[PDB]
Amino acid sequence: PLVGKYLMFTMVLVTFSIVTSVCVLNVHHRSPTTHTMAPWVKVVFLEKLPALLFMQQPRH
Amino acid sequence: MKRPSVVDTDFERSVKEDWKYVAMVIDRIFLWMFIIVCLLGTVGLFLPPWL
Known part of the structure; x- marks a missing residue:
């Protein structure tokens, strides 16, 4: 049934979302006393990706 | 896993962070162990019937 197939696909998406939420x-919950942020992580996630998503970190 | 070389003056906050890291390390031991077991168990339980 198309309803069953759509529910199955939604369940797969939700499992993927659970994994992603665990990663996030x-x-x-990371602090400078336990993890070190690589420069590439900086230049990507704090500069480039936010611009594409219209987030513009205040960086006050 | 390389812990950042941070010298925290407070010996009470540092010890906590030492504990918080001891908890984190213990998790990573079992995350590796369980990942191996799950893959081996599943492949070690369903591969022979297929072949």
């Missing part, structure tokens, strides 16, 4: 929670 791991990233969020």
Whole structure:
């Protein structure tokens, strides 16, 4: 059934979202006393990617 | 895993962060162990029937 197929695809997406949320929670709870941020991580996530998504870190 | 070389003056916050890192390391031991077991167990349980 198309309804069953659509529900199956949604469940796959939600499992992927669970994995992604686990990764994001791991990233969020990081401090300079336990992890060191590589320069590439900086130049990507704090400069380039936010611009594409219209986020413009205040950087006050 | 390379812990950042941070010299935290407070011996009470540093010890906590030492504990917080000891907890993190223990997780990474089992994350590696369980990943291996799951893959080996699944492949070690369903591969022979297929072949």
